[PDB]
């Protein structure tokens, strides 16, 4: 997976804003959400999100679901560093285990449990 956000913004600019997001909103974590390129589902309007540290993946799912207007029958998986986070886990946990050196958490989403 190759996030277009890392190509749209130079690193040092991302590392800068990621620091200021964390500073001003310590109760929230900055997340970038893009879709796996082969995945067959709708695209997301925006890529950069500010998520409470206590929000669960399931809630982020249903948020991402109705933002993509996805039905309950349809599948939707998260991938942070090519692993599927457990659906009853907080974003704050995921940030402190997987945030990158620009201080963003990167999450790919797909309709399949293994993407390509």
Estimate nothing, just give the exact number of structural domains.
Answer: 1
- In whole angstroms, the N-to-C terminal distance is 8 Å
Under CATH at level 1, the class stands as Alpha Beta
Count of DSSP E strands? 4
What proportion of the residues is helical, as a percent range?
25-40%
**CATH topology description:** Ubiquitin-like (UB roll)
SSE sequence, one letter per element: HHEEHEHE
Indicate the proportion of strand residues. 15-25%
Inertia-based shape: globular
Report the CATH superfamily: Phosphatidylinositol 3-kinase Catalytic Subunit, Chain A, domain 1
**Order of strands in the sheet with the most strands?**
2-1-4-3
Please state the CA-atom Rg, rounded to the nearest Å.
14 Å
CATH structural architecture? Roll
- Largest sheet composition: 4 strands, mixed
Number of separate helices = 4
Topology:
Elements: H1 4-8, H2 11-24, E1 28-35, E2 48-52, H3 57-68, E3 77-79, H4 91-98, E4 105-110
Parallel strand pairs: 1-4
Antiparallel strand pairs: 1-2, 3-4
Description:
It contains four helices and four strands. 34% of the residues lie in helices and 19% in strands. By secondary structure, the protein is an alpha+beta fold. Strands 2-1-4-3 form a four-stranded mixed sheet. It has one domain: Phosphatidylinositol 3-kinase Catalytic Subunit, Chain A, domain 1 (Ubiquitin-like (UB roll), Roll).
Task: Give the key terms.
alpha+beta, 4-stranded mixed β-sheet, globular, Ubiquitin-like (UB roll), protein transport, 34% helix, Atg8-like, 19% strand, 116 residues, apoptosis
